[PDB]
A paper describes a structure:
To further explore species-specific differences, we assembled chimeric POLγ complexes using mouse POLγA with human POLγB (mAhB) and vice versa (hAmB), then analyzed their conformations by cryo-EM. While R conformers resembled their wild-type counterparts, E conformers revealed key distinctions. To test this, we created chimeric enzymes by swapping POLγB, forming hAmB (hPOLγA + mPolγB) and mAhB (mPolγA + hPOLγB). Strikingly, mPolγA paired with hPOLγB exhibited a reduced kcat compared to the complete mouse holoenzyme, while hPOLγA combined with mPolγB showed a modest but steady increase in activity. Replacing hPOLγB with mPolγB increased rolling-circle replication, while the reverse swap reduced DNA synthesis. Notably, replacing mPolγB with its human counterpart significantly reduces enzyme activity, underscoring the importance of this accessory subunit in polymerase function.
DNA polymerase γ (POLγ), the sole polymerase for mitochondrial DNA (mtDNA) replication, functions as a heterotrimer with one catalytic POLγA subunit and two POLγB accessory subunits. The POLG gene encodes the 140 kDa POLγA subunit, which possesses polymerase, exonuclease, and lyase activities, while POLG2 encodes the 55 kDa POLγB subunit, which enhances DNA binding and processivity. With over 300 known variants, POLG mutations are the leading cause of mitochondrial disease linked to a single nuclear gene4. Cryogenic electron microscopy highlighted structural differences between human and mouse POLγ, particularly in the POLγB subunit, which may explain the higher activity of mouse POLγ and the reduced severity of mutations in mice.
Author numbering:
A (entry chain B): 67 to 137, 177 to 218, 229 to 354, 369 to 482
B (entry chain C): 67 to 138, 178 to 218, 230 to 354, 369 to 482
C (entry chain A): 51 to 231, 246 to 299, 326 to 480, 508 to 610, 626 to 647, 709 to 966, 1029 to 1211
The structure:
Amino acid sequence: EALLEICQRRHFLSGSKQQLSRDSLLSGCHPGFGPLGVELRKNLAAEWWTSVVVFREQVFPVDALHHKPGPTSGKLRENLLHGALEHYVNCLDLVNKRLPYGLAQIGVCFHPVKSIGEKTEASLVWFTPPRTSNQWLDFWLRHRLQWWRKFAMSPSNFSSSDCQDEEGRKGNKLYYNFPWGKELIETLWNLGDHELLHMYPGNVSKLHGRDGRKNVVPCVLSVNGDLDRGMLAYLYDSFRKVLKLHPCLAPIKVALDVGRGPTLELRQVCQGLFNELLENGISVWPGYLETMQSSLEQLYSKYDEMSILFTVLVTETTLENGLIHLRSRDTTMKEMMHISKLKDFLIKYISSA
Amino acid sequence: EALLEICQRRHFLSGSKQQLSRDSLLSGCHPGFGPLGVELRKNLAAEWWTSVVVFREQVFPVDALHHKPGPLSGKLRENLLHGALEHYVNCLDLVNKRLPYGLAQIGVCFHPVSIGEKTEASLVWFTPPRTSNQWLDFWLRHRLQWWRKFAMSPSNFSSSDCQDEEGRKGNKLYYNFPWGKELIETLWNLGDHELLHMYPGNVSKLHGRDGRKNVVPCVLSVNGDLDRGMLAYLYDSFRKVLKLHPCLAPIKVALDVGRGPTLELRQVCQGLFNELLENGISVWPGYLETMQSSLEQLYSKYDEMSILFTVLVTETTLENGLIHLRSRDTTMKEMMHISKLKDFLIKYISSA
Amino acid sequence: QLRLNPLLIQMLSRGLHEQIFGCGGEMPDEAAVQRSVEHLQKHGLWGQPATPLPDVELRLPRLFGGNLDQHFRLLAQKQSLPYLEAAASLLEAQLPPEPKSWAWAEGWTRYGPEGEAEPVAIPEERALVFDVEVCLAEGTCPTLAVAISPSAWYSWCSRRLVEERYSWTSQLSPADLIPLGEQLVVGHNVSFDRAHIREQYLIQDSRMRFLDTMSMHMAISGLSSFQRSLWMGAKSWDWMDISSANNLADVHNLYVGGPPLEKEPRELFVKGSMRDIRENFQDLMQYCARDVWATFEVFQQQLPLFLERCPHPVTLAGMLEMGVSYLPVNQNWERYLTEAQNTYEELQREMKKSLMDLANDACQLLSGERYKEDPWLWDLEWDLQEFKQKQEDPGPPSEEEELQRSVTAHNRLQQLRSTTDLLPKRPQHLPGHPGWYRKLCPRLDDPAWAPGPSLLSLQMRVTPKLMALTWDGFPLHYSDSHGWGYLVPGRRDVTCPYRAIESLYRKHCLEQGKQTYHHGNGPYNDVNIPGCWFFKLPHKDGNNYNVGSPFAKDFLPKMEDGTLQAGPGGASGPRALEINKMISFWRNAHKRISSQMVVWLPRSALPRVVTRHPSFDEEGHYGAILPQVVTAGTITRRAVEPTWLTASNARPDRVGSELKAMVQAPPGYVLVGADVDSQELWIAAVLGDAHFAGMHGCTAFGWMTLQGRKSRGTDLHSKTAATVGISREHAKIFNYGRIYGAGQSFAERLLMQFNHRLTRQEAAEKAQQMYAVGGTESEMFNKLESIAMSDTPRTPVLGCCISRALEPSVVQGEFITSRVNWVVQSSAVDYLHLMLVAMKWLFEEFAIDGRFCISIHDEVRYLVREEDRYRAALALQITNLLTRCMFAYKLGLNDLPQSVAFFSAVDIDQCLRKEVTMDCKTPSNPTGMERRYGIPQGEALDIYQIIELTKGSLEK
DNA sequence: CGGGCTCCTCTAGACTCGAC
DNA sequence: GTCGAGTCTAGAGGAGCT
Ligand SMILES: Nc1ccn([C@H]2C[C@H](O)[C@@H](COP(=O)(O)OP(=O)(O)OP(=O)(O)O)O2)c(=O)n1
Ligand SMILES: [Ca+2]
C-alpha cells in the first residue's frame, strides 16, 4: 500500500514495513506511532472529549486503574467498563442521585492476541432509568455515528448495525468500510442492571437513582470507541498525494518558511510569528530551521503528505509591507495576507471548520 | 488529614475513607482519583506539555508502549526512558540527524511495591557530550522554575545535587511536605552508555551531527511524578479554602440560580453556561439542583472545590442583567452585567 | 328496509328515507326511466348486478323546518343571529374622531369624549374592529393594538413595549396576550389578529367569532392568480375595475375609493427594533388607527354586498365556524423541530462535503491552463485579480539571552503591524483564486462564514459542471435561453474543447458497450456551441419547458437507469439526488414550520379532564397553535393557510414530513374526524344525473361513480388505476385532469412520467382510448358549462354567486376553465359549510363536549372529549347523511343511494396523520411515532360499528 | 387549457454609497 | 471622477397540499 509507506515516511507510524501489517495495526501489536500519529490521536481524543464530556452537565471523568488487583494474582484490564462501575455509587454524590448521568474515560486496554495488544479506547458508561433505556440507546447511537461522520471525507463509509447479545440484550455496532472490509470501531450495549447488582451485592437501596420523582435502579448503557482504529480509519479516509485530514484532526496546522535573506531580520520575524501562533494554540512546523534548501515543489509535496493546512512563506518583502505568502493544502492556490492578520484568520479557519 | 478528608469528600480522591493513605498516595497503590483530581492532573499534564514540548522546536512527542515484549515473558515498563531510546535512531530523521533534540512523553509507569502505577512526565535530551552539563543545568533551572511557578509558597520546591553510583552527575527536586521532603523530579546525565548497549555495532547510525562533525550523543533524563506533584500542589493550596492556581484548578466558575421563576431563570443560566463552555471555562452546573442550600453553605462547598468564582442569577438578572459575582480568594461580593462576565473571566485567567 | 332505484340502485333505507325525505314521493317519469336505461345499455353498463349493502335503521333527530333546506336555514339562522346583530350594530354606529394623543400606559385604555384616555380592563363590547401590530425583531408577541367599538375608541400596549427588561421569556403564554374577554371581532386578515387574543387558546371554546374583510373581498370580487398577475402588471379589461388585490390599500380603493391609504415607509415593525417603536409611538399608533378606520369603511361597504351575493345563512354560519380552527400541541413539537433541523443539517453537510471536495480539486486545473480542455470547466471565469496596495551547538541560552531574544522577536513582529495603513479599507476577497471559486466562498465579514466554497449547492449552475455530469455520454451544458442541455460531439458546421468531448464520448461508447447519430429534445442551433450540437434535456412537463436543475426528482429514474451519470462514478450522483429528494420539502418549509406561534397553556388554564387523566405528565407542556386560515382565499372560496393546508404527509424518505403527526390531542381528549369519499367526483356525477334524467346513476358516469367500493377496490379511482396501471393516488390526478380540461397530450405525458414502462406510443394510445370514450360524462360537462356561461353563475346548492371579476359580462369568453372549475369547487365549499353547521347543531343539541379542530377541505377534525368519541362519530355519520341528502334535495332528486350515505370510516386517533395505521417513519423520525413519542394506533369505524357501540343514540 | 394555492432558492439587472 | 461592494427587486423553476 502507498498509504502505509506515506505513514511510515511522514512519521505517522513507527517500525519497519514487516512490523506494520494490516493485522498488526488492527490488533495492537504494532511497535507504536510516530510523532505525527501521536498528535493525530491526541486530536481525536480531544474532539471526543469535547463532544461527549465538555458539553454535558451530567458526564464526568473517571479514573480506572490499568491493573485488576486481587482474585490469586492480578491481571491487565481488557475494558474500561468494569472500572467505571466501581465509581457509580461514589459519583451519585456529584449529581445528587439525579439520573441520568455518565462516566467517561480514555485509556489503554490490553487484549490477548501469545502476544499482547494495547488499544486506546474511549468509553462512556451511561446510567439511565430503565424506562428510557431504549430511547437513550438510540440517542447515543445517532450522536456517536454523527460524531464519527463529522470529520469524515466520505461519511457513507461509517455505518451502523443493530445487533443482539446472548442474553437477548439490544445493542449496536459501528463500522468503517476499510478497503478490505468493515471493521468494528464502536459498540453500544444496553446491559441493564445485572452488572451493577453483581458488583454491588446486598441491599439495592444503595444503588437507587431518581427518575424524576421515582427512585429506581438504573439500566447501564456502555459505549466503547476505538481511538487507534479510529485514527487508522481517518488516515485511510483522508487518503497528487495528499492526506486530507480534517482541519480539527490534522496534527500540524501551519508550516513556516523563509527566503534567502536578510537572514538576521527574517529569522527574528519568523521567531516572532512562530511564538505568536504557538501562544494561540496553532501547531507550527519550524521549516525555517531546515539546513537544506529545496524547490518549492518538493517542499509542498512533503507538507501535503503530512496534512499541513497552510504554508506560510516569510520573505524580505515582509519587512517592507508586512505581506506573507500563504498557501492552502486543499486548493494549492497561493494568496497574500498581511502578517498582522494571520493569527485571526487561522483561528477563524480552525474554529469554523 | 483534614486536607485528605476534604479531597475525598469533594471528589479529588476517589475511594473509601479508610482506603486512602499517605503511603498509598505516595506509591501509586490507591483506588484512584475523583473527577476533580482527574481534571487537576489533566491540567498539570497540559501545563507540563505546554512548557516543555510546545514552544521548543527540538522536542517531539514519543509513543512508548506499556509492556516490553521479547526475552529479557513480557514485562510492564518501569520507566519512560527505555521506550524513548528505542525511538532514537528513527527519530533522527525528523531533525535530519541534527543534535541536540529531545523526546518527551507523559504516560504510566508500573512500580512494584503490589503493582503501583505512577503517571510520569519524562524528557530524554540527546545532546553532544561537549554541552551535556550545560544543558543539564539549563533543564534543572527550567524545571525548578516550572514547579515553583504555580506554587503559593515556592520556597518549598527545593533542589539538590547528587552523584550516581557510576559517577554520573545529576540533580533532584523535592517538595517540602508537612512531614518531610518527597522527591518529585530527578535529572540525570547518563551518557551514551544505554544508547550503545541498546545499539551494539554499527555506531554510524548513532552518530549525530554536532555541527559539522558526527558524534554519539550523551543522554539526559528529566523524570517527574505528576501524581506526587498533584499531591504537592494540593498541600500547597490548603476557613477551609483550597487556593489552587487559576491555571490548575479543575473547575473555574460555579454557576447558580437563586430565585423564581424557575423556568425563566434556568434559561438564562443555561445560556450563560453554554457561552462559558464555548470559550474554554470549566463551569459547575449548580443551577440544576432542586433543593437549595444556604448561600453561605454553597460558598463553603465551592471554596473547598477550588472554584475561582461563584455566579448567582436572580430575579434582578431578568430586569437589568446584573449577576452576583463572588471571588474565592478575596471573598468579595459584587454585581456585574452578564454580558461582561465571560470577558472578565478570560482576562482574569490570562492575567495569572 | 331495502329499497331500489328505478335503475336498480340500492337507495336509502325506508327508516331513513321516511325520516329525511318523508313519505309521498312521486312516481318517476317512466319515459325518463326508459331513456336512462337506453343510455346505460348504450355503453354496456345496464344489467350488471350489485350486492345489497346491509340497510341501516337509525332514529334521526327531529329535522324541524318542513324539509331539509328549511332545517339547514333554521340552524344557520339560530347560529348566526347573535353575530349578525353585532355586525348590524357596527354598521349603524357613529364614532368620535380618532384621538390626537394616544395613551402610553400598559393594558387596555378607553378614550371617552374629547379623547379622554381611561384605563379599562377589557373592552366591554360585543362588536369590535381590531388590528394588532407585532414587532418582528423580538418575536411573535403582540406589541400594540387599536380597537373600534360602536361607542368608544380603545388602544392596547404590552409590557414588552412600555417596560424595559434585560430578558423576556421566549415561550409564549396566555398571560402576555390581548384580553378581549357572544362577541364578534371584525378585522382585515383577522386570523393574524385572532392569534394574539389570550382566550382563543383555552380548550373550552368561548363564544367568539371573527369576520374577515379579506375573505369577504375574495367572496365578492376575488381575482384569479393569473388574473392577479395581470392586474399587478397593468397597475377586454373591464374586470380590472371591479376587482382588486387583497391589500388593504387596493381593497379600500376599490370598495370605498377615498384618499389613498398610506403605509409607513420606515417599516418599524418588520425591519425595526423595540427602541425604534418606543421612539415613534404616536406615529405608529396613528397608522394603526388609520388602518382600523379603513377596515371599518371596507366592512361597511362589504357586509351588504356579501349577503346580497351569498344570501344563504349557511354560508355565513359556516364561515364563522371555519375561523375557530384549533390545533393542540405538546412538548413533542419542539423535539420535532430540533430533530428535523438537525437531520436537515446532517444531510446538507454531507452533500456540501461531497461538492466542496469536487470544487477544491478543480482549482488545480488553473496551473498550466488545463481547464481549457475540461469539457465542463472551460466556460467558467478562470481569472486572478492582483493584490491591491495603496554550525556547532551554541549551548543552552542563558536566561537574559532567552528574554532578549523573545522581546526582540516580539518587537520585530510588532513593528510590522504599522504597515496595515497601506492596505485598502475594503479587504479584498480571495484575489488569488479563480473567479468561479470566489463566488462560492462566503466573505470573512459574514457572521456565518465557513471555510472553503461553503455556499455550494445542487441548485447552483456550476454543480452539474463540478460533478462532471453526463447524459448518455454527453457532457451537460447550460444555455441562457433553454436551460440545461448536453453537447453531442462530432459537429463540423474561451472556446469549447470539442476534441476533448469527442474523446470522452469515444471512451464512453467503447467502455459502456455502445457503438446525426442521436435523437432527443432537438438540436437547438441557436445556442451554437462550436463543434457540437446542443440537445435539450427532456422536461416532465413537455418539450417547451426548460429544466432548471438536472437534480430534480424526475431524473432519479433516469439516474438509476444509466442515462444520467456523474463523472466520479459509483453512488455519488445517486446519493446527491437522494439527499436532494429527502431535504427538498424541509428546505422550503422550515422557516414556516419553525416560526409557528405556539402558546403554552399553564396548568391553571388546563381543564380538570386533562389534569386528572392518568396520562397527564406533570413535567410536560401542553400548548396550541391557532392556524391563520383565511376562510376564503381563492376564487372558489376555499380556505387558505400557507403551512397547515400545505403540510406534507409522512413519507418514508422526506425529512420533517411528520408535521401533522405532531398535532397530538391533550390527555382526556381524542381527535374524531373523517374524509369525504370522492367528494368532487360525486358532486359532478350528481350534477350530471340531475341534469340528465333526475335519477341517481342515470348517466353512465354517475352509474360508474356510484357502483363500487373503496375496500373492494372496485371504485372509480381504483378501477381507473387498474385500467391504466397507475396507483390510485395518481389515478386521482389523471381523472381530475380529464375532468378539468386536460388534453390528450397531458395524459400522454402523465402516463410516460408515472408508468415508466409505457413508451410514447402506448401512453398516446391509452390516452386516446380513455378520452375518446354523446359520451359517458357528456351531461356533466354540459351542465357545468351551462352554469358557467349563464349571466350570473351561482352554486346550485347554496346559490352563492361567482366573483364580479369572473362574470361573462365583463370577460368576453376568457378564463372559462377557471369558471367551470369554480362550480364544483364552490359546491365542495358549500358541502363543508353544511357539514360545519350540522355538526355544531348536533354538538349543541346533544351536549357533546368537543370543538371544531381543523378542516383541510375534504377533511374535518373535531377535538372531542374521550368519552364522547363514539357519539361524535355517530354525529359525523348523521351529518354526512344529511349533507348528502341536502345536496340531492337542492338538485331535485328527493332520494339518496345507500352507498354514499355514510362515511367509509370515522377515524378516532390522537394525531392528525392521514391514516390511522401509519407509524410516520421519516429520516427525522426513524423509530416511529409509537417508539419515540408513544402514540398508539387509533381506530377507524364504519357506520355499523358506530351504531353497535352507541346503540344508535346521540343522547348520553 | 387540468385547476386552485403557498413558498422557497438562484440569478441577473439596477441603484446607491463610500473609498481610491 | 470613477469603480467596486451592499442592497433591493423581479423573474424562473421546483416542490408541498387538496
Ligand atoms: N390532483 C387533484 C387533487 C385533488 N383535486 C380536488 C378534487 C377532489 O375532490 C378534492 C379532494 O381531493 P381528494 O384527494 O380527496 O380526492 P378524492 O376525494 O377523490 O379522494 P378520496 O375519495 O380518497 O377522498 O380536490 C383535484 O382537482 N386535483
Ligand atoms: Ca376526499
